[PDB]
Amino acid sequence: LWREKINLLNARLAEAQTSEEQLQSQLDLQKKVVSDHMQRYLQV
Amino acid sequence: LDEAQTIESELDKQLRAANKVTCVLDTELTLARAAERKAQQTAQQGMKEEERELSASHFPVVTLEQLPDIRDLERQHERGIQHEIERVKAELHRLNIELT
Amino acid sequence: LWREKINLLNARLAEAQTSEEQLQSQLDLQKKVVSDHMQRYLQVDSDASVAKAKLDEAQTIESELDKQLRAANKVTCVLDTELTLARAAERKAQQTAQQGMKEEERELSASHFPVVTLEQLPDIRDLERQHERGIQHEIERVKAELHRLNIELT
């Protein structure tokens, strides 16, 4: 049962890690938006 | 720029919450690994085939989510077995009195 | 011991959160440096290229500080999960202890039984099982002697 619990926790941890990666990508996208808006300030 | 810096903070907080969930799951996994190792060493003593048949014929099956509870519930099962064995021992005891 | 564990885990969690707050302040300072280098690129091997390169370096340091803050967050979360488990175990042992013991019973149990330090609290519950084993063994021995006396009496 402890091995089964380990496997279930591994699956849940993988789900949580995928969510964390999605949020990290969103944060990086916001940073890229900041960079794009600075570059617009200079591109004109 | 200012607006995106403001939004960046919120996504950061949500990412921190996700990290908290991940860390909780990792701590649970570590505890499960330790308990797995202990129950493995306890289980390594093993059983012959007839021993496993004997244990199965009275002992119940254990559910996963009560896995840590298997210890207190094991003590409860041990107490039931001990009460029955005590009753049989008392019967033996009375029978020895009668015999003498 | 679980109340003591709750208090000690609260203290350790506070220390971890103070470290997390210091890392957060460092991360904010690195973000301010990032914004400073970011503004130089707005305003100015040229000066703009140097501003861009230093902006990238500041962002790299900011990401490193953020990862360190995440490690501190992991420490804090581990301590918090331990505190929650300690709270649950404390409430359980409290309800078990709420049935109550008389002062005489407490004195006899203390004189007859040991107690274990806080960090070895898991070991105290194993010692409970070992004490149960020994006490039951002595109980059955004395019961056997009682029956031997009963048979002699018979």
Supply C5's token pair: 């564990």
The angle formed by the CA atoms of residues C29, A22 and A38, to the nearest 5 degrees, is 45
Q: Is residue B59 within 8 Å of B77, Cβ to Cβ?
A: yes
Solving technique: cryo-EM
d(CA B84, CA B54): 17
Q: How far is CA C119 from the centre of its chain?
A: 10
Q: Which residue of B has its CA nearest to A17?
A: B22
Which helix (H) or strand (E) element contains residue C76? helix C47-98
Round to whole Å and give the CA distance between A1 and B35: 10
For residues C52 and C115, the answer to whether their CB atoms sit within 8 Å is no
**Considering only CB atoms, which chain C residues are within 8 Å of A42?**
41-42
Can you spell out the DSSP letters for C4-66? HHHHHHHHHHHHHHHHHHHHHHHHHHHHHHHHHHHHHHHH---HHHHHHHHHHHHHHHHHHHH
Question: Residue C136 and residue C130: Cα distance in Å, rounded?
Answer: 10
User: What are C's interface residues with B at a Cβ cutoff of 8 A?
Assistant: 70, 73-74, 77-78, 81-82, 147, 150-151, 154
Compare CB distances from C78 to B16, B27, B93 and report the shortest one's residue.
B27
How many other C-beta atoms can be found within 10 angstroms of the C-beta atom of residue B17?
Answer: 14
Backbone torsions φ then ψ of C90, nearest 5 degrees: -65, -45
Chain A nearest-CA residue for B6: A30
Element (H, E) at B85: helix B70-99
Contact in structure between C81 and B27 (CB atoms under 8 Å) = yes
Enter the tokens of residue A33. 């938006």
H-run or E-run covering B67:
none
Who contacts C8 (Cβ-Cβ below 8 Å, separation ≥6)? C118
CA distance B72 to C130: 15
